[PDB]
Amino acid sequence: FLGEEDIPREPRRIVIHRGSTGLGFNIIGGEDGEGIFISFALAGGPADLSGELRKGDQILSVNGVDLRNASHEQAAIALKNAGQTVTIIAQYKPEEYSRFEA
């Protein structure tokens, strides 16, 4: 899509239960959707058990709509109206999320 570089872990859509009950997981971002990524997983949640998503992973798109430039709250809007299932793309990005945790 762009070129050849580090980070072999390619993006993949993870299956999650009805977003309505997707509270187990959290979302963190900045302004003007500078970069929204997964915050942390809560054990017992639907996305935690059904999905293998964890802290550090980056979100590219949800249920279709891309959240690459979606604000912090803007992302929640997509998850809220997720429905029965929301396809979220995950990709190894410890440095990207590391920006938040300092």
Swiss-Prot record:
Free-text description of this protein's post-translational modifications in UniProt: Palmitoylated. Palmitoylation is required for targeting to postsynaptic density, plasma membrane and synapses. Palmitoylation by ZDHHC2 occurs when the synaptic activity decreases and induces DLG4 synaptic clustering. Palmitoylation by ZDHHC15 regulates trafficking to the postsynaptic density and function in synaptogenesis. Palmitoylation may play a role in glutamate receptor GRIA1 synapse clustering. Depalmitoylated by ABHD17A and ABHD17B and to a lesser extent by ABHD17C, ABHD12, ABHD13, LYPLA1 and LYPLA2. Ubiquitinated by MDM2 in response to NMDA receptor activation, leading to proteasome-mediated degradation of DLG4 which is required for AMPA receptor endocytosis.
Domain PDZ: 13-93
Subcellular locations according to the entry: Cell membrane; Postsynaptic density; Synapse; Cytoplasm
Tissues and organs where the protein is expressed, per its UniProt entry: Expressed in brain (at protein level). Detected in juxtaparanodal zones in the central nervous system and at nerve terminal plexuses of basket cells in the cerebellum. Expressed in cerebrum. Expressed in hippocampal neurons (at protein level). Isoform 1 and isoform 2: highly expressed in cerebellum, cortex, hippocampus, and corpus striatum.
Domains (record comment): The PDZ domain 3 mediates interaction with ADR1B.
Description of how the protein assembles with itself and partners: Interacts through its PDZ domains with ANO2 and NETO1. Interacts with KCNJ4. Interacts through its first two PDZ domains with GRIN2A, GRIN2B, GRIN2C and GRIN2D. Interacts with ERBB4. Interacts with KCNA1, KCNA2, KCNA3 and KCNA4. Interacts with LRRC4 and LRRC4B. Interacts with SYNGAP1. Interacts with ASIC3. Interacts with SEMA4C. Interacts with CXADR. Interacts with KCND2. Interacts (via first PDZ domain) with CRIPT. Interacts through its first PDZ domain with GRIK2 and KCNA4. Interacts through its second PDZ domain with the PDZ domain of NOS1 or the C-terminus of CAPON.
Protein's job: Postsynaptic scaffolding protein that plays a critical role in synaptogenesis and synaptic plasticity by providing a platform for the postsynaptic clustering of crucial synaptic proteins. Interacts with the cytoplasmic tail of NMDA receptor subunits and shaker-type potassium channels. Required for synaptic plasticity associated with NMDA receptor signaling. Overexpression or depletion of DLG4 changes the ratio of excitatory to inhibitory synapses in hippocampal neurons. May reduce the amplitude of ASIC3 acid-evoked currents by retaining the channel intracellularly.
Family: Belongs to the MAGUK family.
Name of this chain's protein: Disks large homolog 4
Native source organism of the sequence: Rattus norvegicus (Rat)
Part of the whole protein covered: 301 to 402 of 724
